Design a protein around this ligand. Structure first.
Ligand SMILES: O=c1nc[nH]c2c1ncn2[C@H]1C[C@H](O)[C@@H](COP(=O)(O)OP(=O)(O)OP(=O)(O)O)O1
Ligand SMILES: [Ca+2]
Ligand SMILES: [Ca+2]
Length: 426
DNA sequence: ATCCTCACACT
DNA sequence: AGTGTGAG
């Protein structure tokens, strides 16, 4: 079981929110620019950064005022605000554009607002039969890198890419319709078409990874950005993983990746191969150890889920520091703002996707607590009605109020969160 | 004071 | 049902 059964692609829009504003505002194209939300505090937090601005070291999470110190000619687009909070509608809608184009080629899994996995196994099969037995020309792959090539016995980047592609296509066994390397190559030709279709029909540029599973696809995608795709073959994995830091593989970027590194005394993904599956399972659990055992050999079976629609519709606002909501009527007003956006997006969903949400999830944070949420509670969602939702949300969080007064809210609320979930066909 | 999101595992 | 992790 070499884990070469499937062809999987991960497509990822290049600096997506920036492109969305650059498409709409041509003055911003091919310039250092970023997208920010909320202008008042330190110029606004940066959530997306064009590749021109990145070369000055501008990053996400920075304050816009500080980014202007790194890049004085940085241009800024501010996220729409509605009802006193950020409104992402323009980007969800531009996201819909991209998901619908990709869905014309294969079944996709929406992984985030701007990336989708594609299972190309079947599409590659059909294309292999229409392809008689004729060779794959390099012109079919004008923006594809083959990771690990060129090797063996040109100083500029496009030169390297071409030499690597040529070495790869020279040794392609195009007479064997079951060689896994042929299938990825044909998968990559389809992804070139997918990416040309996206750019022509939206103007949005993107990168893609093509491999045999989701984690290699995602890893491959970020090896050659922007506006390029990378094929990571099963055979490339030992050299690729030998110096790949663990935290770079999807889901090892957090506490678990930190435990793998610490407990085992290792640094790179390839070092995991020296351990038995029983050993990995003993340190990290049955499923995490089985998964680590196979993943460090480049094998993973997580399937491409057929799901293009989010499972939850959510809507939240932080109230940091001195702004924490300390009165009962303050908490009521913002729950109404939240419910009002929620209601408007839910009714778009019902009309667009023939489904209804049946459960309302209310979360709050409390000043003094350490974590994202401090409490989560749930009631029934029977009506796309902003007042009822916010009345029901208040009902189910009223007793969190440690205050003895009735008009006050102690401890003050630092976050409000409303989430419709548990959708059913309608 | 990166804010606002979404999926999923664990219990 | 509620919590926590990991990601965009
Ligand atoms: O913390 C965040 N808070 C609010 N919004 C965020 C956040 N993190 C990412 N986002 C939004 C904007 C980003 O454009 C889009 C895709 O995210 P993401 O793929 O990670 O980065 P990106 O498309 O901007 O650049 P790139 O893929 O070329 O590295 O998600
Ligand atoms: Ca992405
Ligand atoms: Ca992206």
């Amino acid at each position: 079981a070499t884990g070469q059964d499937r062809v999987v692609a991960l497509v990822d829009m290049d600096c997506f929110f920036v492109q969305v504003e650059q498409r709409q505002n041509p003055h911003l194209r091919n310039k250092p620019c970023a997208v920010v939300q909320y202008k008042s505090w330190k110029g606004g937090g940066i959530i997306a950064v064009s590749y021109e601005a990145r070369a000055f070291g501008v990053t996400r999470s920075m304050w816009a005022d500080d980014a202007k110190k790194l890049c004085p000619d940085l241009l800024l687009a501010q996220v729409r605000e509605s009802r006193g909070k950020a409104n992402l509608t323009k980007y969800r809608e531009a996201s819909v554009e991209v998901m619908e184009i990709m869905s014309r080629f294969a079944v996709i899994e929406r992984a985030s607002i701007d990336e989708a996995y594609v299972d190309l196994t079947s599409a590659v099969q059909e294309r292999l039969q229409k392809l008689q037995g004729q060779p794959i020309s390099a012109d079919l792959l004008p923006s594809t890198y083959i990771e690990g090539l060129p090797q063996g016995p040109t100083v500029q980047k496009e030169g390297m890419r071409k030499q690597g592609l040529f070495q790869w296509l020279d040794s392609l066994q195009i007479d064997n319709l079951t060689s896994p390397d042929l299938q990825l190559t044909v998968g990559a030709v389809i992804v070139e078409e997918m990416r040309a279709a996206i750019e022509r029909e939206t103007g949005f540029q993107c990168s893609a990874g093509i491999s045999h599973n989701k984690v290699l696809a995602k890893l491959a995608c970020g090896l050659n950005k922007p506006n390029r795709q990378t094929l990571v073959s099963h055979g490339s994995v030992p050299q690729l993983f030998s110096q790949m830091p663990i935290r770079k593989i999807r889901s090892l970027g957090g506490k678990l990746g930190a435990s793998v590194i610490e407990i085992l005394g290792i640094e790179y993904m390839g070092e995991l191969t020296q351990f038995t599956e029983s050993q990995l399972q003993s340190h990290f659990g049955e499923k995490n150890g089985s998964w680590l055992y196979a993943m460090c050999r480049g094998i993973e079976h997580d399937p491409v889920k057929p799901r293009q629609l989010p499972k939850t519709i959510g809507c939240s606002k932080n109230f940091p520091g001195k702004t924490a909501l300390a009165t009962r009527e303050q908490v009521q007003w913002w729950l109404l703002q939240l419910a009002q956006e929620l209601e408007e997006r839910l009714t778009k969903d019902r009309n667009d996707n023939d489904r209804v949400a049946t459960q309302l999830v209310v979360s709050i944070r409390v000043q003094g607590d350490k974590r994202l949420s401090s409490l989560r509670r749930c009631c029934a969602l029977t009506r796309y009605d902003a007042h009822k939702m916010s009345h029901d949300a208040f009902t189910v969080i009223k007793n969190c109020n440690t205050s003895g007064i009735q008009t006050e809210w102690s401890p003050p609320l630092t976050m409000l969160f409303l989430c419709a979930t548990k959708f059913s066909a309608s």
